[model samples]
Target chain A: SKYSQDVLQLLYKNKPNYISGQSIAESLNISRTAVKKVIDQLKLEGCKIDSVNHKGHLLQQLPDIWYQGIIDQYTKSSALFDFSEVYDSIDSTQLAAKKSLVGNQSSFFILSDEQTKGRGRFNRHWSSKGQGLWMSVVLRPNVAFSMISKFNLFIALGIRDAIQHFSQDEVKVKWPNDIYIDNGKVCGFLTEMVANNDGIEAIICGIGINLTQQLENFDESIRHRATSIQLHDKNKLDRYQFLERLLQEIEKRYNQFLTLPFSEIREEYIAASNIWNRTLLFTENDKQFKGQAIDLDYDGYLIVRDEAGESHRLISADIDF
Target chain B: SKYSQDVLQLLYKNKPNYISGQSIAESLNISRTAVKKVIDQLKLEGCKIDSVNHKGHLLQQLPDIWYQGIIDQYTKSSALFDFSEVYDSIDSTQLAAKKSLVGNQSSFFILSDEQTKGRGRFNRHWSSKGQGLWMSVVLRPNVAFSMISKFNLFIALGIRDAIQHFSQDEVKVKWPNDIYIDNGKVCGFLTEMVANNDGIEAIICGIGINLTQQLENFDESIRHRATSIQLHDKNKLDRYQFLERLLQEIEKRYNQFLTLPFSEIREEYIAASNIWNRTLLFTENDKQFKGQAIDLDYDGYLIVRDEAGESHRLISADIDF
Candidate 1:
């Protein structure tokens, strides 16, 4: 059965007053026992449900879940310009937001409880657990088209900050996508955008975090490189607050990213690189090449030096790291 | 039953000569009358066959077919290269070539009688007619990643040259893909390339041509635009000869294209543009705008100018033309 909006409204309205359970039930048109059960469920879900003798229940604090109850609070806040929460969606949230942004819907939050078919780079399948965050932020900035590739860098930094803040494990970044710990990737980010044939289009950003999970859920091959936050830090972190912090961090870096030369941010990327200044083997165009990670330029490429010291700036690759 | 390679070798070797019916049977390990049946089928297929009192059987002339028989000639010619032929294949020959190209197979030929799962842009379904030309060309060019898009322009020009050799229907190219006649599409060319971090690794150019089909085989919506040589010329056409002419034309253009500057060839694209100098309603970043298709620049983009004289170059759009 669906919980009515009236229930949350009732809790918000009679906050400081002691209303008898029978009287509250009559006004709300529900049985007294039903009202008590709804309040109890809210309490167990982590919301502070405070009840008084011969009185109804009141919400003392918000739960950390990313449900409608939390988003309703965000919609009321002035921090967001536009907000949308969907129960289900077919494609990537970023792709949906991209169509909207192309149609002129910008500065909006596109949140989905679950994705029926989540898409990654090159249209690869992305399995999204219903309860976890699946979102795409639409932004139309004044940045040049070539620099838009660095959008992944911005996403990586934002997620790393969120994970580091809530846990004791040190968060590291593998260039272009993964947010990692102890050389194993904990989160993956996918950034896709349209570029102007003459200029630039909208940038659609998608961030995927590996939240609470058992180690056995992952495929054996991927299990070595992929990990969850709960695997390292036993404390089950609050999801909603973490998302809030991620949004805040992304907002700040995106602004700075627009103002400064992109190369300025390479220092942070270099410091957090999982295999900084190390020899690595990678394949491109079906040819394997070995090189040492050297430096980064303003164009968001990892400068790799081969045997002869010819520096190759890599923007994208199928990475083992 | 499939013809043995020995039967093919004997037929090829005895060209313009009257080999005795007994001799052909002895060479191919078949009965004399059975050899005559294969000869009869070849004669019915328009192969020039002659019988005389002194000469028991003579392959008087080469069959104007584009099957393995033509491939044998191509293989013997020092001017031709990467010549290959397959009677029946499960996969789209284009996809098979692409897989091989990515795995470092520089160049190869793929001729298939059918493709089970052929694809077009935006996942449009394409029927691979058993007699139609289903082929792909693989090339590894030494160029930057950005230059990869220019291959589409090169391919469009090559296709135009090939199609123009047969008919004078004023064939036009519709932007990135599609070969058209009388405001309807007749052919589609898809170029799939994989690029290394520094440059392009390989490109698989897939081409689909309509042949040997009447109007009834087409979907209702496409029937108005789609056509075949038989339909357009109002007569039965030879499929093998047509495919051979196309292969020769493409090979010539490809060689010329490798040395020519892009600006010189871009003029060919301008002449082929269906929507050039026409008014267009387009969307960019989800915002709709109306403009006139004033010109095309060097990079194969439609330059459109609005009422305010601000010009925009579109990458992909559904245009009026």
Candidate 2:
């Protein structure tokens, strides 16, 4: 659950030479005490490590199957695949990812076994337990601000198709970036960007999905509408396997987003949308109305024609339909 | 200087309850080892503490003369007055202050004895050593995005006037929030804000002032254009005293900004500006031209008349004179 793997990887990076514990701790965003504990765990797990007061530690040999290897092997062709960290638990991967100062040209990934105080869209509470996949993908893409909407659809399709492959069941994308399976939500995404007036400098995408837990053990507030992969498949699944596959899909999709045109992602997202052509009930500005989710427009807005026979583009995120 | 004061205050806040070391570590954004080090430093500084294994520690008493008290005493009637942290040395107060998640309504001040990686306009190098004041004032003001420029001027005036009072020398405000002393620069302001489309959620103000350093010891790259308070005023001054005065002035100015009209601030800013009506050499749109600084317009732009005899507003920050 802790960062023994990341610490060991850092030690492995500079093999024969000793690296200070403080250096490892600072680079990995952990504590020196944690480095000591991780070193002790490594010793117990059958790896010899040399530690000194002035000098930090050196890994003498190779012994590893952590996701750093899985994630590294599976991901390709994206700057976000440069580095990654896995935590036992954190406040929010989104918050942790944004800790670096702005205008960063490189990228990394943050994943946690649990989140102490996770968040959903617009600062809403999200219950993140050990059974769910809680991750934040940090990307520094060279894209204009106007392309942000199309970027959203691209990422959603990445996760949606990956889930469909894993479940071998119908997986659908809802308005914005929620993933649904029949009656309940299986996944969600929260996109945050650091941008200037004309271009986006950085983007931190927070993604959450319930994997193994039954809905009964979930947070009471969201339990009724929350579903998991195990619930749909009635079988156990390895989260690392899912994460590896998700990385592959996202990495390829991200490459396509950078190199190819947007029409492919746009059409795929519209086809995978559960709300497409369905009747949706939503309220706007104290007005309740029924509208059909007619089609996604060229610019990625959900276009709807209300009973008043007026065409409306769902631009504001406050519109939940 | 090592946040012993902050750690002790946290201990004081929970009085009888034993706050866990990890809890203090998480809340303070420091490591458990850092909290432990701070605890030992507190004990050496004549503080009595009761510590246990599971439960953290209890502060028996505090005999303190820290700026938490000084800053608290000097500040009033602002959300930014809620909290403050002082560090011996940090990477950048701006970076450290921004580690918190955004949309925070309450404000805090982050002051450091030195900055290892200080920054100036557009991420340029700033040499911050022990004898200077490097601070980041985090503000969550109730203002629109359009008012950010005026807010920038308000903070500069706060610092500029306080410097004038302390040195009893003329301290002039330059274009875009640089404080000038004769031919060299004494202070600089870097304003960073987190905003949505219409409203600014938070503002982090990074203010750096060279207080006592001689140009001989300053960074060679910027020493030619740099000056200090000690250089301007032959008498040495206490940084804390100046910081207290600066806080009082800023607190008052901030209050006036919220309560009074913008014209008062505009008029006062123009009066104190060194660039007002000065012949300036600057380049715009790949064209090098000379211009006369005329006045700051109502929108807070520096209105200039170029050699072409055309009135233009200097809006881009890339322009320097």
Candidate 3:
């Protein structure tokens, strides 16, 4: 499933030195022709590898591809989730993770190269190119059910930090659960809670971050609004590197959400927010109306002024900014 | 699957007269021998069908069995749910109903003769004798998230009223969600919610009522706490008649819940409750403590006086009476 990562790990170890095709093939116990295919595939994924006829390959830079091998290589103790699975393509990471969450309290995640059936908040079809980071995290936190709202924003904040590491462009959280760059929206997520009479059993959150999508990668309708790290940042990003940082930042943020006071984290959310004083469309009782977004309340709830100049608190707000 | 219902319907139409086997066979376009088999099966299910050598068959008293044909015969517009399914036996009526609740707002109910994998609150093993009423209701009521607590109680109340119709014995609610008779526990339910970011999409509640179970039908561990209608009531209860009353009472209670104020309904729940002024053991944060049950609060919350002599309102109370 990951021949590229197997070969890339060798190139990664001896980056300063050149290794012969015979040595590469013999070491990995594969044919020299198979070694050449791995080299071609790595280069195809935008890896800058120097190659000569006799002296095989020297890795100068890495590729953008994400796979199970890279996640398998992750041995972090600080991660919120204990288990993970990566797929080349699936129906939806959300659904795949949900089907597996029958009764176990074990936290896990499912990442996919592409989702043929992707969905975001409100059952909207999420754009899923092979390059984007499309993954679902199955969380079984020891917390109150009220913490679910915070967990959603905690993810947005975590991904915002992860994406911000790649670029100078400030990544702002689009209120409740969206990430945006200066140019356009970078991420949106779907949060599904499988709850019983006691309380929430587990919450499966599918977060899709636009990473390597070029202009041609998006649908024409979303071209004006959709954005990726590659779109905003001049330097190309390694999917493995971004994911490593994602695991770290999300783990840190998860603990932060649990330990920190709501007012503290709520302020952090407000500081990195993009919805302040903006004229936005909001839905109430299935009816849409315009509101000027004001301050985020104590719990990260959007406090907005209605068209009638009335102040309103918005929880589970479906807004357009 | 419902040959007995087909033949029973024939007898129902002409109950005043002895319906001839040839007449029933010719009318329903089946053989006379097929009609005799239906008569035998109906008798097997506790129906008194008097058959003479030459005088065909006369329907005396009905059977205790329930099937799809019975629900198919229910064309009442007052029904809270729009659709229903009745199975002879299933892995779980809860699981069967849950699998079918994908992306549909239409409410439905699923009933079964027994659940091979029956479950009540706290994932406890629910006794699944074939004689009991094992069913799940898929509710898609347009209400607030706070209304979920009310909905749980509403179901308990509905089933309480439904069961009350068959016996003159006062049926009491074992509040937040269990039904009890003067002797022991009678009915319990499992409420599972499938929710997204916005709010609750639907709640599938599985209600299992002990209908025809005798002392031998219960597990040795649960025999002291468990009781059934057949164990308590002297008369042979017709399953069809009980189900007919159930559908009516549940529907009437459902409409009453939406229309009437909660205090009005809460009083009704409190009046039919058996928990007030009783000494009980409660679990708080997984620690067991003794408390004296006081009263039902405005929202049917169990008001209990703790060992510390302080009043505590229990929302999701895991208590022992």
Candidate 4:
């Protein structure tokens, strides 16, 4: 319903060049009045666009990296997702994706420059200040709705693979969907879905990564628990390239995830996890327990053995330490 | 953000009695102008509301049973949920609950008179034709996000308990969230949630029941596989009374579910199920396998042993006869 997403892409693609209103209207299959409205809305959102009355409009500067040309360059090889959008600043990419799911627009992606109210796994606040990657994607798969539990594992594998392409740092998946470089967290993802009487209607997978945040950027409480591409690699990673590679890997893995058996990805997830042999303390329903992290079961549950030597398959929990 | 929900509740509570716009606005803490707007919108949606010159608005007919007055009558003793709304016909009650989840309005219920496009588990079509209860609720619970897998079982138990209160006919629960009378399906529920890096944002639990549908109401393919209260008992059941009991039982069971250990509900769910000790065929992905329906694990997965005597915990599957 919002054309600003479309108009911004069109303007960014033809940056520094005046794209005629007639051409913009025809390309988007919208009226010239609609194009004008979008341009006006974009400018209000702080995008600098030079509008020439008779000639049309030209984007004065780049908007965000998840814009059309940049994402298209690396993701052209895959068709896992069909559409994309980027916001300079928004509430949460996950929230936007949920709206898309409700509207029945699946197989789409959305990225944001910053999230004023970014969220983490437990309704916890995540600092999505600038220089970080805040993105979400909507998927409607053919699998049973209950199979949604394993998606966090598959998506975590995709993120781990994509990060491996840029650096030699050991990127490990923390059980569900948190990405860790050595020990510090670099990225995290939230998978949400809506289902009806039958199967899953849509899944909105929101991932937030610390692309280039310094230690000082994080709050004191989480300073020791967080890391970033820039902090780990000692360089400002190209945000656009990171996103492209990430999407490509996700597209490949997501396709395989749907077609292949759970064990295929389960093995890969096990390989990338640092929890298999470690002693960990986690909580379930406000009760704390200590256990040895054994391995991930076929259902993507973390298998842990307690002090009593009894094994437990944890479907959901927070690894406390 | 929607006052229409509250407006409808007020009008319905005073059905056949005039509810002044000023009082309605004051009760809901909204402007009188907003009340008028909501009234106009309701009228457009086929609600029968009579507005006299400066007198107030009166509902001509009884609205859906999930309305505030109807539900409050049964759920007044519990505080499981705090708000309610209803629609004559909407896309899906689950979708409406998701919107509420995104808006951060947990502990609320939404109902629809009829569902034009009802959904079942695995995205199957659920006939919410008339004479059925199509409702969804938003819950914000304090539990690990992973524990959500067990909610379907918990909700199914709630539905089973509620249905038993109305009729002496046996009400059994299918493995996850389907309610059955003998072997025929009577009610179904879908539990969906939105989560982030932290934990669950909200859970949208949707339940649909055939209150008084006749045999001809069901499609030919599912007529043998489905049953309703009318089909089970020749008397036409009172819809409002059924909903009140349903919500009350749900509130009691849901509170216990949140407070008690998983084993408590697991035991109750197992006792209500008819699938155990039966021979069943279920499909995983595109493959079919025959197994003996054994029991439900503490995590609520269907534990099935195949012909080879290897036990497999079924997460998502379509049970075939």
Best by DockQ: 3
- Residues A199-264, model 2: lDDT tens digits: 455667789988877778777987877788878774456676677678877887778778867765
True contacts kept of 3: 0.60
Q: Residue B234 of candidate 1: its Cα lDDT?
A: 44
lDDT of each: 0.65, 0.72, 0.77, 0.74
For every candidate, give the share of true A-B contacts it also has: 0.06, 0.06, 0.60, 0.40
lDDT of 3 by residue, B52-130 (tens): 7777778787655555554665633534677788787778887777667754577888888767888777667773545
Measured with C-alpha atoms, the lDDT of residue B48 in candidate 4 is 72
Q: Model 2 clash tally?
A: 0
lDDT of 2 by residue, B125-217 (tens): 874545788988877776654455667777888889888876756888886758988767889886766543224556778889888788897
Q: How far off is residue B91 in model 1, in Å?
A: 5.5
List model 4 lDDT by residue over B1-321, tens digit each.
276667776786776689899999889888889889988887876677899988999977443334545455334455777777767678888877777667465488888888878876656787454578899888887665555676666777778887777655898977666788867788888777665434566778888888777788878988888888766665557677677778877777678768876777777777888877767787766788788877777666778898779999866557765
Work out the TM-score per prediction: 0.53, 0.65, 0.82, 0.68
lDDT ranking from best candidate downward: 3, 4, 2, 1
lDDT of each residue in A1-321, candidate 3, tens digit only: 256777876776676899888888898898989999888887887888999987788888765555454465563343466778888788888877776775457788888888888877766777455579988888777665556777787777888899999967889988677888884888887667777647777887888898888889888987888788988777767777788888888788778877876677787888898887668898766699898877877776778898989999876788787
Better of 1 and 4 by lDDT: 4
DockQ of candidate 1 against the true complex: 0.05
Error of 4 at B113 (Å): 0.4
Residue B156, model 3: Cα distance from true site in angstroms: 1.7
Backbone collision tally, model 4: 22
The DockQ-based CAPRI class assigned to model 1 is incorrect
The most accurate candidate by lDDT is 3
* Per-candidate RMSD, Å: 12.2, 12.4, 5.0, 7.8
